[PDB]
Amino acid sequence: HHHMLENKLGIINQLELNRVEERVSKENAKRLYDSGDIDRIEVGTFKGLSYIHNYLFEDIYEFAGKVRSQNISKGNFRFAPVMYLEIALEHIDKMPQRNLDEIVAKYVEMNIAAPFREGNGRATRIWLDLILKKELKRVVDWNLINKEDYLSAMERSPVKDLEIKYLISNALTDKINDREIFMKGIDISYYYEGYTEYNVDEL
């Protein structure tokens, strides 16, 4: 267990560590967008996801953007055992992304893979939007996706991706250059994970 800022700042409370982590990474997410850096990276690849994860969590989480060395025990959900991860990430890279069916299937596959130690959800929600922006000229208006519905559809996706597919298509917007949709979407993505201390636009 190693979070680069826990021993740097006197952090004794998990709530305080979670507070610093959200603040620092939200500032990184803001810069990723405004610098235009978000639009100069490989779309729908592990290389692309790795870039986002490292950009958000460098200096916060150890091995940011790097593939994990052990298995994930987050709930009863079956993430890919680490022995399958090299093969899994190569398959996802080669998966087609022509339409919503193909894009959702790809996203479900990346959610199962969960290649990093932690922050898989937040980095893959940004990654997804970039596939939608490039291939459909759409993004998700995350304000149209309720938290409880989102998690339920995600738990179900290894069996059937129909529920998550609906949530995304119904939330799709053509306002791909709308800064507020991106910023609000960052706060919602963090809310799905229990981080509500800050509003990235106030950073």
Residue numbers in the entry: 5 to 207
What do the study's own words say?
We determined crystal structures of unbound, phosphate-bound, AMP-bound, and ATPγS-bound wild-type EfFIC (EfFICWT) and of unbound and sulfate-bound EfFIC carrying a mutation of the catalytic histidine into an alanine (EfFICH111A). All EfFIC monomers resemble closely to each other and to structures of other class III FIC proteins. Mutation of the catalytic histidine (H111A), of the metal-binding acidic residue in the FIC motif (E115A), or of the inhibitory glutamate completely impaired deAMPylation of AMP-FAMEfFICE190G (mutant panels).
The most frequent PTM reaction catalyzed by FIC enzymes is the addition of AMP using ATP as a cofactor, coined AMPylation or adenylylation. Enterococcus faecalis FIC belongs to class III FIC proteins, which are comprised of a single FIC domain and carry an autoinhibitory glutamate in their C-terminal α-helix. We discover that EfFIC has both AMPylation and deAMPylation activities borne by the same active site. Furthermore, the conserved glutamate implements a Ca2+-controlled metal switch that tunes the balance between these activities without conformational change.
